[PDB]
């Protein structure tokens, strides 16, 4: 079940999503206690007696709550920190009571903001966890972040592609109004958007034939609402610490794939591999940092039809430790510094 000695400095508990597969009903969420070197696989339904849902997509903590995106579901799972009970399903519906069918979540104050694939972004309270509030962005819109007081969020048109074709532009809102300020033109097939230093975003674009591999990394900068830099490097998904950046690219038709340290101020590459020690990835899934220790998680998918693996890295490139079989197709890390009340 693991391979090195699992250990975290600074932070008591992790928590991995898993998408399962597209319409297989499958997703999962893992809790790995290292206060008591404990793993549950099965954390959700283990504690609620129901399934997480399809394609569970985003997972993220807030205040004391821990909220799942669940895309196909179509719905918020609201989930008490101390516990692990469902607080609240809020169920993402059009106005006719199709699926909006809800991708990523960001926050600010008080306030949770979901964006989805029908081309929205809903308020929801933190406290009274009611929707209060729907304004449109862009076509399918993939991700949202929160920066210098405004929404960005990324309007891929993915779902778009073989009719209009994909969408090229980030949409801005702003929070105190919540109204949409404007659509900043970055390029097709808009993906992954995080925050950066100096009220910066970054967000990756992922051609109009995602399968063919034009990938971009664009800077965009917060206090003109204009890009900045367009990056030349193949980025698919990436992961921030100040200027540097930790990225991976995949191609899609010949299975290749790169994981590297990037220089954001140059738009050099840092090493051509981040991993210096030999470890073998084949189907690089998703990247983020733990933000109480630095070190970067990367997930493991396989071919999708096997449960994956997650695998902790110093920022030197060696493997700390890696959790195997941890779920179908884990796709999110998220850490937290405090122990839950839940064995
Ligand atoms: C690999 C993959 C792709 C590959 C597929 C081909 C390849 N070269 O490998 C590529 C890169 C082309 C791809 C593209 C897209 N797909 Co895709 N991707 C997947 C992934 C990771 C695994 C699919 C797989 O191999 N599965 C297991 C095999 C054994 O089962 P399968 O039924 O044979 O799988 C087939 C379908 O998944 C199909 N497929 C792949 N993507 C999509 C998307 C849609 C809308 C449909 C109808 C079918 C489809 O291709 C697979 C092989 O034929 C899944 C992850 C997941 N399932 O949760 C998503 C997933 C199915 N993909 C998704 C998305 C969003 C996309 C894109 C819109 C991405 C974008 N451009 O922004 C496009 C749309 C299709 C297109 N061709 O333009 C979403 C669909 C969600 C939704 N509500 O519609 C999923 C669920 C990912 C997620 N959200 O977590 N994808
Ligand atoms: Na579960
Ligand atoms: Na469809
Ligand atoms: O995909």
Do not use: W
Request: hydrophobic residues 35%.
């Amino acid at each position: 079940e693991s391979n090195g000695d699992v250990f975290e400095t600074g932070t008591a508990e992790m928590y991995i999503l898993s998408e399962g597969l597209f319409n297989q009903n499958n997703s999962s969420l893992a809790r790995y206690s290292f206060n008591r070197q404990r793993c549950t696989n099965n954390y959700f339904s283990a504690n609620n007696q129901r399934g997480l849902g399809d394609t569970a997509n985003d997972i993220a903590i807030y205040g004391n709550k821990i909220y799942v995106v669940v895309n196909v579901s179509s719905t918020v799972e609201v989930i008490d920190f101390p516990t692990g009970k469902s607080i609240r399903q809020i169920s993402m519906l059009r106005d006719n009571g199709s699926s909006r069918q809800p991708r990523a979540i960001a926050f600010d104050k008080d306030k949770a903001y979901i964006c989805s694939y029908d081309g929205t972004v809903a308020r929801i309270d933190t406290t009274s966890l009611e929707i209060e509030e729907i304004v449109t962005v862009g076509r399918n819109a993939e991700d949202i972040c929160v920066q210098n007081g405004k929404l960005y969020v990324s309007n891929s048109g993915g779902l778009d592609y073989s009719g209009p074709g994909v969408d090229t532009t980030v949409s801005v809102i702003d929070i105190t109004t919540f109204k949409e300020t404007k659509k900043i033109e970055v390029g097709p097939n808009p993906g992954k958007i995080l925050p950066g230093l100096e009220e910066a975003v970054y967000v990756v674009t992922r051609g109009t034939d995602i399968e063919a591999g034009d990938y971009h990394l664009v800077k965009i900068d917060s206090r003109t609402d204009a890009v900045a830099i367009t990056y030349d490097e193949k980025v698919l998904s990436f992961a921030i610490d100040g200027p540097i950046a930790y990225l991976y690219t995949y191609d899609y038709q010949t299975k290749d794939s790169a994981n590297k340290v990037f220089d954001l101020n140059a738009g050099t590459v840092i090493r051509d591999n981040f991993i210096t020690d030999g470890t073998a990835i084949q189907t690089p899934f998703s990247i983020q940092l733990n933000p109480f220790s630095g070190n970067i998680y990367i997930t493991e998918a396989y071919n999708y039809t096997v449960k994956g693996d997650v695998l902790c890295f110093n920022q030197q490139g060696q493997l700390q430790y890696r959790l195997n079989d941890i779920g179908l197709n884990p796709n999110t890390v998220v850490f937290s510094d405090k122990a839950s009340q839940n064995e």
